[PDB]
């Protein structure tokens, strides 16, 4: 549920979407999703399309995203726990 | 403190060079803020100094309290005409 | 009103969108808006997106833009006086 | 006068040389018709052989119509073999 | 009537809808109309929405559009006179 | 009178490359063929001598009465092995 | 035609839509259609708009398209034969 | 075998460098798999070495990936760090 709370945060914060995008390729994001999200001009808008492409309540996809965040920058997880 | 740092800091990061930028990237990488690849992306950005700075500043966007602080403290050991108090 | 009058010039006259960007980022442009304007290919298109963020009724944002123009290029500003 | 000065001598200014270019951008910063930023980008990022010209040609869009006179007068400091100079 | 005589041609011939838009913004086009025309991806369709906003008897806007066309390309303006 | 010279030689310009490409488009700027803005738009596209060429080719919609041709004369001043065919 | 059979593959596979677009110009479609196809962000969506312009009953244009496919990517076509 | 090559991973192919990527694109051009356009598109548009590599990964040539044993065999020619060589 942490994720949903930073579903809002990260859409306005993270700037490394293209790398996280990897963590979901085929796992959760097919090429139709992938290209669409990549085509967006801003990192905020890239995340906006991305999170509308993961409407699954499945914890797996959320957990994969978190692991991606942990392996990408490793900072936002503490910064959003506050 | 934290929110004040960044708006005032785009404000003053326009007064700088490449000696500074080069060193900045080394510490921001080693302080685990971002990967080799983003450091590579900023270095291979088709600009010289200026847009590369706005790029580092796009790394302070997700930045938390300590993430701004590591940058500002790195600024501290030089002539901070940036007015870093 | 001067800037609103001459925006048709300015959209296609002043080049240094990035300098102008700084002041507006502080006052009016949020980070997502900053990225949006930056993603546009041409200085004319960059300004076009900028003026779409600028509220027409706001003197303050207009005035900040003018000051930005003066402190970026006041020699365009002198050619506008002429 | 100013409008004419840009209207032509562009393919002709495209056949110019680093000697003049190097001196020119230094003085354009000094005369403040050119900003620090754009000159800083153009010298490295743009092509050396040619895009060097297209850089000052990015002043052709009124970054100084009075600067057209400043440019031509700087051209007068050396061999103004181009027409209108 | 110059426009009503060539409407089909110039809808599909001129590329710089956005440039033409600048003059219109100043005189006739409000910001809403500007954004509307810009939101069309393809230049022929972008012009189609432009001319759908201006198919009335207002001669001032029509007349200023001609001068805009003369200042736009200076090539198609002669080529359509011929 | 010139449309067909490219209507049937379109894909041929998908082989035209090099800094001849920039040059091809900076003559059209001098004449009223391309605006400064359109010249800027073509240059800000990021293909190597491919989409560039298709952008200029998007500027052939104008009856090239003296436009389509001004391109052809620039093609003539270059070794047009495609024209030679 | 195989192409009609395998169009679902094609929309998701062929990553040089722009080259194919070149061949289909003066020979098949009207350039308004060129710009239209080019507009949408993804290669899958670009192909989707392309096939919506291309009549299935027009066998002639389909042959030229196949030759274009053979000359464009030149490996996918043989993998589609397999 | 081909299917596994089509998936494998990206993060593992992402952990590469220059002096392999350059040689990969050379062979992919010469093996007629991608034309000049994709070579130009990868080398010009996709600047970020990673972005470049994700672009070659978009040259997985979807169900054209019998050519991707040209890629795998080039990986075999050099130091393979991947578990799925």
XYZ file of C-alpha atoms in Angstrom:
668
model
C 0.000 0.000 0.000
C 3.206 2.047 0.359
C 3.353 1.844 -3.430
C -0.071 3.484 -3.978
C 0.984 6.325 -1.684
C 4.079 6.782 -3.835
C 1.955 6.075 -6.909
C 1.221 9.788 -6.421
C 4.700 10.776 -5.284
C 6.771 9.105 -7.990
C 4.582 10.446 -10.818
C 5.850 13.854 -9.702
C 9.347 12.775 -8.541
C 11.426 9.966 -10.213
C 13.306 10.733 -13.477
C 14.733 7.287 -14.434
C 11.624 5.729 -15.987
C 13.421 4.245 -19.017
C 15.561 2.005 -16.735
C 12.678 0.911 -14.497
C 10.836 0.260 -17.738
C 13.187 -2.683 -18.080
C 12.043 -4.235 -14.820
C 8.579 -4.627 -16.314
C 9.277 -5.649 -19.892
C 7.354 -8.856 -20.532
C 7.088 -9.324 -16.788
C 4.125 -6.951 -16.876
C 4.662 -4.592 -19.836
C 4.329 -5.904 -23.387
C 5.745 -3.939 -26.336
C 2.431 -2.121 -26.857
C 2.797 -0.652 -23.356
C 6.571 -0.176 -23.566
C 6.727 1.939 -26.719
C 3.720 4.015 -25.607
C 5.308 4.929 -22.261
C 8.667 5.675 -23.925
C 7.091 8.077 -26.430
C 5.976 10.456 -23.662
C 8.012 13.706 -23.497
C 8.493 14.186 -19.748
C 9.484 11.706 -17.043
C 6.334 12.732 -15.045
C 4.148 12.000 -18.061
C 6.104 8.794 -18.749
C 5.267 7.561 -15.252
C 1.678 8.736 -15.654
C 1.175 6.510 -18.702
C 3.136 3.727 -17.049
C 1.032 3.545 -13.902
C -2.104 3.576 -16.039
C -0.560 0.562 -17.719
C -0.243 -1.320 -14.433
C -3.850 -1.184 -13.055
C -3.268 -4.668 -11.691
C -3.744 -4.938 -7.928
C -1.257 -7.837 -7.984
C 1.447 -7.374 -5.389
C 4.027 -8.997 -7.708
C 4.093 -6.058 -10.168
C 4.183 -3.604 -7.253
C 7.014 -5.564 -5.615
C 8.960 -5.699 -8.906
C 8.576 -1.924 -9.189
C 9.854 -1.461 -5.621
C 12.859 -3.701 -6.285
C 13.505 -1.665 -9.436
C 13.338 1.533 -7.372
C 15.705 0.004 -4.808
C 18.171 -0.978 -7.535
C 17.812 2.261 -9.512
C 18.436 5.117 -7.070
C 17.835 3.564 -3.594
C 16.822 6.926 -2.152
C 13.152 7.488 -2.791
C 12.085 4.596 -0.555
C 13.467 6.311 2.555
C 12.432 9.747 1.339
C 8.810 8.703 0.993
C 8.745 6.848 4.310
C 9.733 10.208 5.811
C 15.511 24.158 4.793
C 15.164 21.412 2.177
C 12.662 23.080 -0.182
C 14.527 26.418 0.072
C 17.784 24.793 -1.030
C 16.819 23.882 -4.583
C 14.968 26.863 -6.033
C 17.677 29.120 -4.635
C 20.153 26.575 -5.997
C 19.092 26.491 -9.619
C 19.326 30.237 -8.994
C 23.042 30.023 -8.259
C 24.241 26.941 -10.099
C 24.528 29.196 -13.177
C 27.848 30.430 -11.704
C 30.285 27.539 -12.208
C 32.613 25.495 -14.436
C 33.632 21.935 -15.434
C 36.322 21.243 -12.803
C 33.357 21.521 -10.452
C 30.954 19.515 -12.622
C 33.448 16.692 -13.139
C 34.025 16.369 -9.391
C 30.290 16.729 -8.649
C 29.487 13.683 -10.766
C 32.114 11.524 -9.056
C 30.610 12.144 -5.621
C 26.963 11.904 -6.710
C 27.720 8.507 -8.247
C 29.672 7.243 -5.231
C 26.999 8.494 -2.793
C 24.700 5.978 -4.513
C 22.243 8.651 -5.705
C 22.262 7.386 -9.285
C 23.844 4.710 -11.447
C 26.852 4.871 -13.774
C 24.390 5.093 -16.680
C 22.777 8.400 -15.608
C 26.238 9.817 -14.928
C 27.164 8.623 -18.437
C 23.942 10.163 -19.832
C 24.700 13.561 -18.261
C 28.305 13.431 -19.514
C 27.165 12.468 -23.015
C 24.378 15.077 -23.055
C 24.740 17.238 -26.191
C 25.566 20.409 -24.237
C 28.564 21.919 -22.437
C 28.219 22.564 -18.664
C 24.865 24.419 -18.676
C 22.293 21.800 -19.708
C 24.431 19.190 -17.903
C 23.810 21.285 -14.747
C 20.034 21.306 -15.344
C 20.481 17.536 -15.651
C 22.168 17.186 -12.248
C 19.349 19.388 -10.996
C 16.968 16.829 -12.461
C 18.719 14.426 -10.088
C 17.898 16.742 -7.171
C 14.245 16.636 -8.228
C 13.646 13.157 -6.664
C 16.195 14.154 -4.041
C 15.322 14.038 -0.369
C 16.679 16.036 2.535
C 20.053 14.313 2.508
C 20.284 14.191 -1.289
C 20.312 17.980 -1.535
C 22.571 18.046 1.513
C 25.309 15.866 0.035
C 25.398 18.181 -2.996
C 25.458 21.374 -0.908
C 28.113 19.943 1.433
C 30.243 19.073 -1.613
C 29.748 22.698 -2.692
C 30.959 23.776 0.788
C 34.595 22.717 0.312
C 35.011 25.222 -2.548
C 34.335 28.914 -3.168
C 30.539 28.908 -2.900
C 29.765 32.211 -4.563
C 26.487 30.267 -4.795
C 25.890 31.716 -1.302
C 25.555 28.298 0.343
C 26.035 29.723 3.901
C 0.579 44.437 -22.141
C 3.749 44.816 -24.210
C 4.819 41.183 -24.141
C 1.324 39.881 -24.992
C 1.325 42.271 -27.972
C 4.714 41.157 -29.269
C 4.621 37.434 -28.457
C 4.262 36.698 -32.209
C 7.710 38.235 -32.684
C 9.148 36.765 -29.504
C 8.048 33.169 -30.137
C 10.237 33.296 -33.254
C 12.840 35.936 -32.379
C 14.583 35.118 -29.085
C 16.495 31.845 -29.063
C 17.706 31.281 -25.502
C 14.661 29.510 -24.085
C 16.811 27.760 -21.456
C 17.933 31.017 -19.780
C 14.368 32.322 -19.739
C 13.368 28.964 -18.287
C 15.231 29.536 -15.047
C 13.227 32.463 -13.701
C 9.893 30.945 -14.664
C 10.815 27.646 -13.003
C 11.130 29.541 -9.727
C 7.854 31.429 -9.912
C 5.340 29.683 -12.172
C 6.764 26.607 -13.898
C 6.468 23.377 -11.921
C 9.047 20.653 -12.695
C 6.662 18.760 -14.980
C 6.010 21.969 -16.934
C 9.754 22.640 -17.146
C 10.388 19.192 -18.654
C 7.432 19.598 -21.044
C 8.754 22.877 -22.465
C 12.295 21.463 -22.721
C 11.133 18.414 -24.695
C 9.875 20.565 -27.582
C 12.264 20.613 -30.591
C 12.490 24.253 -31.672
C 12.933 27.477 -29.711
C 9.645 28.682 -31.351
C 7.808 25.574 -30.208
C 9.484 25.797 -26.782
C 8.116 29.323 -26.354
C 4.726 28.201 -27.668
C 4.423 25.677 -24.832
C 5.734 28.285 -22.392
C 3.025 30.812 -23.222
C 0.414 28.076 -22.844
C 1.585 27.722 -19.250
C 1.516 31.488 -18.737
C -1.874 32.783 -17.394
C -3.030 35.729 -19.479
C -4.616 37.602 -16.541
C -1.419 37.371 -14.477
C 0.689 40.543 -14.703
C 3.252 38.975 -12.366
C 4.207 36.049 -14.624
C 4.199 38.390 -17.644
C 6.443 40.851 -15.803
C 8.800 38.051 -14.708
C 9.016 36.914 -18.339
C 9.827 40.470 -19.476
C 12.535 40.804 -16.829
C 13.869 37.421 -17.962
C 13.919 38.663 -21.568
C 15.680 41.850 -20.456
C 18.277 39.875 -18.499
C 18.695 37.279 -21.254
C 18.315 39.531 -24.276
C 17.622 43.146 -23.901
C 18.997 43.809 -27.401
C 15.908 42.075 -28.806
C 14.121 44.308 -26.290
C 15.844 47.376 -27.777
C 14.830 46.224 -31.281
C 11.291 45.970 -29.887
C 11.519 49.579 -28.640
C 12.650 50.633 -32.134
C 19.589 48.685 -43.196
C 19.565 46.079 -40.408
C 16.999 43.843 -42.158
C 19.068 43.901 -45.387
C 22.253 43.000 -43.497
C 20.747 39.644 -42.508
C 18.785 39.240 -45.765
C 21.975 38.244 -47.600
C 25.672 37.507 -47.124
C 24.726 34.281 -45.334
C 26.091 31.749 -47.813
C 28.875 34.331 -47.991
C 29.325 34.427 -44.218
C 29.127 30.619 -44.431
C 32.474 30.831 -46.230
C 34.198 32.486 -43.274
C 37.067 31.424 -41.003
C 37.838 30.524 -37.379
C 40.227 33.471 -37.012
C 37.405 35.956 -37.363
C 34.851 33.672 -35.665
C 37.009 33.229 -32.566
C 37.579 36.973 -32.240
C 33.953 37.740 -33.110
C 32.233 35.725 -30.382
C 34.633 37.114 -27.763
C 33.620 40.650 -28.671
C 29.889 39.782 -29.022
C 30.044 38.682 -25.378
C 31.973 41.888 -24.556
C 29.392 43.955 -26.440
C 26.759 41.891 -24.570
C 24.714 41.405 -27.749
C 25.621 37.737 -27.249
C 25.022 35.989 -23.936
C 27.509 33.744 -22.165
C 25.237 30.738 -22.639
C 24.785 30.416 -26.386
C 28.369 31.201 -27.333
C 29.411 28.588 -24.758
C 27.215 25.948 -26.447
C 27.991 26.835 -30.057
C 31.787 26.693 -29.809
C 31.928 23.062 -28.670
C 28.621 21.352 -29.394
C 28.094 22.630 -32.954
C 30.383 21.494 -35.795
C 33.754 23.264 -35.911
C 34.283 23.460 -39.692
C 30.861 24.943 -40.493
C 28.256 25.126 -37.716
C 30.591 27.765 -36.232
C 28.969 30.143 -38.748
C 25.373 28.985 -38.247
C 26.026 29.912 -34.617
C 26.453 33.636 -35.254
C 23.709 33.177 -37.849
C 21.631 32.383 -34.756
C 22.107 36.094 -34.045
C 20.495 36.876 -37.413
C 17.110 36.493 -35.724
C 17.275 39.965 -33.992
C 19.573 39.205 -31.026
C 20.621 42.725 -31.998
C 19.634 44.464 -35.222
C 22.072 47.086 -33.950
C 24.364 44.079 -33.574
C 24.233 43.652 -37.348
C 26.221 46.902 -37.455
C 28.446 45.582 -34.676
C 29.027 42.426 -36.736
C 29.763 44.316 -39.966
C 32.075 46.740 -38.145
C 33.939 43.761 -36.685
C 34.184 42.434 -40.249
C 35.626 45.862 -41.200
C 38.483 45.247 -38.703
C 39.734 42.697 -41.262
C 39.189 41.972 -44.983
C 35.520 42.663 -45.718
C 35.663 41.037 -49.152
C 31.936 40.254 -48.916
C 29.423 42.678 -50.464
C 27.752 45.226 -48.185
C 30.852 45.224 -45.892
C -12.570 35.991 -51.624
C -8.933 34.948 -52.206
C -9.271 32.385 -49.443
C -12.685 31.054 -50.542
C -11.100 30.646 -54.018
C -8.106 28.626 -52.799
C -9.311 27.041 -49.561
C -8.822 23.444 -50.711
C -5.306 24.107 -51.973
C -3.937 26.050 -49.041
C -5.545 23.678 -46.490
C -3.257 21.033 -47.954
C -0.294 23.109 -49.171
C 1.140 25.287 -46.380
C 2.970 23.512 -43.570
C 3.552 26.211 -40.954
C 0.072 26.322 -39.384
C 1.675 27.370 -36.098
C 3.409 30.401 -37.641
C 0.143 31.532 -39.245
C -1.456 31.005 -35.866
C 0.680 33.717 -34.268
C -0.915 36.607 -36.162
C -4.395 35.222 -35.537
C -3.745 34.945 -31.806
C -3.020 38.666 -31.728
C -6.142 39.767 -33.606
C -8.873 37.131 -33.497
C -7.797 33.747 -32.114
C -8.229 33.319 -28.385
C -5.933 30.926 -26.539
C -8.550 28.155 -26.517
C -8.741 28.240 -30.314
C -4.935 28.326 -30.569
C -4.578 25.181 -28.442
C -7.392 23.435 -30.347
C -5.710 23.948 -33.730
C -2.305 22.927 -32.325
C -3.675 19.659 -30.904
C -4.169 18.247 -34.414
C -1.087 16.134 -35.383
C -1.173 16.443 -39.184
C -0.574 19.779 -40.912
C -3.440 19.427 -43.488
C -5.850 18.549 -40.676
C -4.393 21.339 -38.517
C -5.190 23.843 -41.277
C -8.626 22.262 -41.719
C -9.476 23.011 -38.073
C -8.007 26.504 -38.497
C -10.213 27.312 -41.489
C -13.149 25.718 -39.662
C -12.671 28.404 -37.020
C -12.438 31.158 -39.659
C -15.019 30.524 -42.483
C -17.042 33.714 -41.842
C -17.466 37.149 -43.480
C -14.906 38.882 -41.229
C -12.691 40.569 -43.845
C -10.115 41.927 -41.395
C -9.035 38.436 -40.283
C -9.181 37.212 -43.894
C -7.116 40.164 -45.099
C -4.529 39.792 -42.345
C -4.277 36.081 -43.222
C -3.333 37.037 -46.809
C -0.501 39.257 -45.564
C 0.487 36.423 -43.222
C 0.558 34.051 -46.218
C 2.696 36.577 -48.102
C 5.088 36.698 -45.120
C 4.895 32.907 -44.523
C 6.539 31.347 -47.573
C 6.359 34.003 -50.372
C 6.423 31.087 -52.820
C 3.031 29.439 -52.587
C 1.440 32.911 -52.493
C 2.652 33.630 -56.033
C 2.036 30.042 -57.130
C -1.619 30.268 -56.143
C -2.028 33.693 -57.790
C -0.845 32.043 -61.032
C 7.410 21.580 -64.305
C 9.651 20.345 -61.464
C 7.252 18.382 -59.245
C 7.765 15.181 -61.239
C 11.551 15.659 -61.053
C 11.019 14.599 -57.428
C 7.573 12.976 -57.551
C 9.494 10.212 -59.357
C 12.819 10.954 -57.587
C 11.536 10.938 -54.006
C 13.086 7.812 -52.475
C 16.242 8.845 -54.324
C 16.661 11.604 -51.753
C 16.730 8.825 -49.130
C 20.262 8.148 -50.433
C 21.327 11.817 -50.524
C 23.445 12.362 -47.382
C 26.498 14.131 -45.864
C 26.894 17.826 -44.933
C 25.635 18.416 -48.474
C 22.300 17.947 -46.668
C 22.644 20.963 -44.373
C 23.945 22.933 -47.345
C 20.966 21.723 -49.409
C 18.623 23.286 -46.855
C 20.546 26.477 -46.028
C 20.208 27.701 -49.593
C 16.415 27.391 -49.351
C 16.565 29.594 -46.231
C 18.245 32.470 -48.112
C 15.381 32.421 -50.588
C 11.901 32.337 -49.096
C 11.622 28.560 -49.600
C 12.051 27.736 -45.905
C 11.383 30.041 -42.939
C 13.933 30.414 -40.132
C 11.523 28.404 -37.967
C 11.130 25.577 -40.514
C 14.911 25.527 -40.981
C 15.177 25.284 -37.178
C 12.533 22.515 -37.142
C 14.399 20.435 -39.734
C 17.718 20.925 -37.931
C 16.229 20.012 -34.549
C 15.131 16.648 -35.955
C 17.802 14.077 -35.069
C 18.201 11.598 -37.962
C 21.543 11.455 -39.790
C 20.647 12.801 -43.263
C 17.375 10.819 -43.495
C 14.352 12.490 -41.883
C 16.214 15.731 -42.708
C 15.725 14.947 -46.379
C 12.077 13.968 -45.905
C 11.464 17.273 -44.114
C 12.750 19.271 -47.085
C 10.714 16.872 -49.187
C 7.717 17.907 -47.081
C 8.515 21.447 -48.240
C 7.965 20.469 -51.904
C 4.177 20.566 -51.433
C 4.578 24.273 -52.424
C 4.387 24.415 -56.215
C 8.139 24.427 -56.572
C 7.836 26.807 -59.463
C 11.169 28.346 -58.421
C 11.443 26.355 -55.180
C 11.462 22.734 -56.278
C 13.978 23.904 -58.864
C 16.235 25.854 -56.505
C 16.819 22.492 -54.827
C 17.549 20.937 -58.248
C 20.224 23.537 -59.061
C 21.910 22.833 -55.728
C 21.723 19.139 -56.650
C 23.381 20.059 -59.989
C 26.263 21.844 -58.217
C 26.873 18.508 -56.415
C 27.817 15.145 -57.966
C 24.302 13.732 -58.389
C 25.024 10.127 -59.283
C 21.297 9.595 -58.751
C 20.490 12.231 -61.382
C 23.201 10.754 -63.642
C 21.607 7.262 -63.562
C -2.175 -13.329 -49.285
C 0.281 -14.218 -46.526
C 0.363 -10.522 -45.648
C -3.375 -10.589 -44.865
C -2.742 -13.698 -42.751
C 0.210 -12.233 -40.875
C -0.794 -8.588 -40.446
C -1.101 -9.135 -36.664
C 2.596 -10.044 -36.615
C 3.383 -7.109 -38.901
C 1.761 -4.486 -36.646
C 3.846 -5.724 -33.740
C 7.044 -6.613 -35.593
C 8.178 -4.308 -38.398
C 10.330 -1.563 -36.906
C 11.012 0.466 -40.085
C 7.511 1.813 -40.743
C 9.018 5.063 -42.068
C 10.923 3.330 -44.901
C 7.778 1.458 -45.951
C 5.987 4.793 -45.776
C 8.357 6.162 -48.408
C 7.492 3.482 -50.967
C 3.773 3.843 -50.426
C 3.844 7.566 -51.194
C 3.448 8.702 -54.789
C 2.545 5.123 -55.716
C -0.182 4.246 -53.197
C -1.456 6.917 -50.772
C -2.025 10.681 -50.547
C 0.653 12.498 -48.474
C -1.947 13.676 -45.982
C -1.953 9.944 -45.145
C 1.871 9.980 -44.878
C 1.800 12.622 -42.149
C -1.128 10.895 -40.420
C 0.720 7.556 -40.150
C 3.910 9.308 -38.991
C 2.106 11.135 -36.175
C 1.248 8.433 -33.544
C 4.151 7.591 -31.175
C 4.684 3.851 -31.611
C 5.723 1.766 -34.596
C 2.806 -0.658 -33.846
C 0.345 2.234 -33.938
C 2.075 3.666 -37.021
C 1.490 0.386 -38.855
C -2.069 0.229 -37.521
C -2.928 3.546 -39.167
C -1.079 2.454 -42.310
C -3.176 -0.668 -42.783
C -6.327 1.362 -42.213
C -5.389 3.453 -45.231
C -4.389 0.490 -47.360
C -7.394 -1.260 -49.043
C -7.319 -5.027 -48.528
C -9.037 -5.516 -51.914
C -6.310 -3.503 -53.668
C -4.011 -6.373 -54.586
C -1.699 -4.209 -56.695
C -0.609 -1.932 -53.829
C -0.197 -5.021 -51.622
C 2.414 -6.449 -54.061
C 4.470 -3.251 -53.918
C 4.146 -3.301 -50.116
C 5.521 -6.871 -50.038
C 8.483 -5.876 -52.201
C 8.974 -2.907 -49.862
C 8.936 -5.284 -46.874
C 11.468 -7.512 -48.649
C 13.738 -4.529 -49.321
C 13.185 -2.853 -45.942
C 14.082 -5.405 -43.281
C 14.783 -8.501 -45.411
C 14.947 -11.030 -42.553
C 11.496 -10.810 -40.968
C 9.913 -11.719 -44.317
C 11.797 -15.030 -44.448
C 10.946 -15.684 -40.786
C 7.309 -15.142 -41.780
C 7.663 -17.648 -44.634
C 9.004 -20.147 -42.064
C 16.357 -21.780 -28.654
C 15.384 -18.769 -30.783
C 12.500 -18.010 -28.372
C 14.916 -18.014 -25.392
C 17.244 -15.668 -27.300
C 14.181 -13.451 -27.906
C 13.590 -13.145 -24.145
C 16.794 -13.915 -22.202
C 17.031 -10.595 -20.423
C 17.788 -6.944 -21.051
C 19.453 -6.003 -17.762
C 22.208 -8.499 -18.622
C 22.588 -7.109 -22.143
C 22.398 -3.674 -20.495
C 25.598 -4.482 -18.611
C 27.795 -3.999 -21.672
C 30.129 -1.326 -23.067
C 31.666 0.211 -26.188
C 34.142 -1.920 -28.193
C 31.396 -4.584 -28.472
C 28.383 -2.444 -29.372
C 30.306 -0.766 -32.191
C 31.334 -4.123 -33.654
C 27.762 -5.436 -33.245
C 26.266 -2.607 -35.318
C 28.969 -3.072 -37.970
C 27.951 -6.700 -38.454
C 24.201 -6.040 -38.283
C 24.605 -3.561 -41.152
C 26.829 -5.856 -43.206
C 24.578 -8.894 -42.632
C 21.772 -6.842 -44.258
C 19.593 -7.375 -41.153
C 19.148 -3.645 -40.607
C 19.668 -1.191 -43.475
C 21.663 2.054 -43.269
C 18.579 3.704 -41.712
C 18.482 1.578 -38.544
C 22.253 1.868 -38.193
C 21.865 5.638 -38.516
C 18.785 5.635 -36.271
C 20.596 3.732 -33.525
C 23.862 5.647 -33.736
C 22.368 9.124 -34.138
C 19.076 9.284 -32.250
C 19.911 6.881 -29.403
C 22.900 8.683 -27.840
C 22.850 7.157 -24.340
C 24.893 3.927 -24.639
C 22.078 2.243 -22.758
C 19.494 3.849 -25.018
C 21.617 2.611 -27.923
C 21.586 -0.928 -26.515
C 17.819 -0.842 -25.945
C 17.575 0.210 -29.586
C 19.585 -2.824 -30.723
C 17.248 -4.788 -28.459
C 14.471 -3.305 -30.571
C 16.439 -4.918 -33.416
C 15.491 -8.225 -31.824
C 13.912 -8.317 -35.317
C 10.582 -9.674 -33.929
C 10.145 -13.204 -35.304
C 13.112 -12.300 -37.448
C 15.389 -13.533 -34.693
C 17.127 -16.264 -36.670
C 19.385 -13.318 -37.517
C 19.908 -12.833 -33.776
C 22.137 -15.895 -33.786
C 24.422 -13.531 -35.727
C 24.319 -11.462 -32.524
C 24.735 -14.526 -30.274
C 27.616 -15.829 -32.419
C 29.289 -12.411 -32.182
C 28.852 -12.723 -28.404
C 30.512 -16.173 -28.677
C 33.421 -14.577 -30.594
C 34.040 -12.316 -27.587
C 33.841 -12.433 -23.784
C 30.338 -13.651 -22.893
C 29.275 -12.546 -19.388
C 25.659 -13.672 -19.837
C 24.517 -17.068 -18.511
C 22.456 -17.399 -21.703
C 25.539 -16.710 -23.888
